[PDB]
């Protein structure tokens, strides 16, 4: 890693735009849990190992 | 060796401890 030369996680941010309601959500590239859309009740991502596996096609802007 | 000694020590102990018990 870089524990003595400043450890920074692997992370990033990405704007996810829902395909069922057009709802714009901020999502941590590593979903630990099931993230639920706040105006669909859908599942955007499912938590597995490392980076949450995104369920099916949902739009993405990478920050 | 230490077989020997352990049983010798034990026999000494018993026999003598027999003589003390008696």
């Amino acid at each position: 890693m870089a524990k003595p030369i400043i450890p920074m996680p692997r992370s990033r941010f990405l704007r996810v735009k829902c395909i069922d309601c057009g709802n714009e959500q901020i999502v941590f590239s590593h979903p630990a849990t099931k993230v639920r859309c706040l105006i669909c009740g859908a599942t955007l991502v499912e938590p597995t190992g490392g980076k949450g596996i995104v369920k099916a096609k949902i739009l993405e802007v990478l920050e | 060796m230490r077989w020997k000694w352990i049983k010798k020590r034990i026999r000494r102990l018993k026999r003598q401890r027999k003589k003390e018990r008696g």
Binding site: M1, F13, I26, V27, F28, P31, T33, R36, E63 | -
Partner: protein, 158 residues
């Protein structure tokens, strides 16, 4: 980094964001954040998981950085947001989760007593409680009159 406690195994290297002031591409008011927290503590979720869902859904990695400064005595974060409202459990969650689990063990052993290993973690979880108790007394979340026992663990849970 590690501590192999009741283990020989190096600990996870999970590490914080080295962000010291918060993202502004992420946006929430002191008022909006406070609502989100109160809603989640109303569900039955607990502060670690409250910080978890907020992270995964609303994109706030830790509350302290976003919130404070809004009363710069100290950092404002989940349970310090809760205590000002009165939603805080008087037992620290740390100590609670611990004891919670513990009472479940006992019931297993109750029915099954031929269990080395299961017996041996009873001994391994109590003794973390003991510690966690000991220091709190002196810090003051739990009165000095208390002392820990398995009947005084079955009373706190019920």
């Amino acid at each position: 980094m590690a501590r192999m406690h009741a283990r020989k195994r190096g600990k996870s290297g999970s590490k914080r964001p080295p962000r010291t002031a918060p993202p502004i591409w992420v946006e929430y008011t002191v008022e909006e954040i406070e609502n989100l927290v109160v809603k989640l503590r109303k569900e039955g979720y607990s502060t670690a998981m409250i910080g978890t869902i907020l992270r995964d859904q609303y994109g706030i990695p830790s509350v302290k950085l976003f919130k404070d400064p809004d009363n710069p005595n100290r950092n404002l974060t989940i349970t310090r947001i809760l205590e000002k409202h009165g939603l805080a459990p008087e037992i620290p969650e740390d100590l609670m989760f611990l004891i919670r689990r513990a009472v479940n063990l006992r019931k297993h052993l109750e029915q099954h007593p031929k269990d080395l290993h299961s017996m041996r973690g009873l001994q391994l979880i109590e003794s973390k409680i003991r510690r966690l108790v000991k220091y709190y007394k002196r810090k003051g979340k739990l009165p000095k009159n208390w002392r820990y026992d398995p009947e005084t663990a079955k009373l706190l849970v019920r």
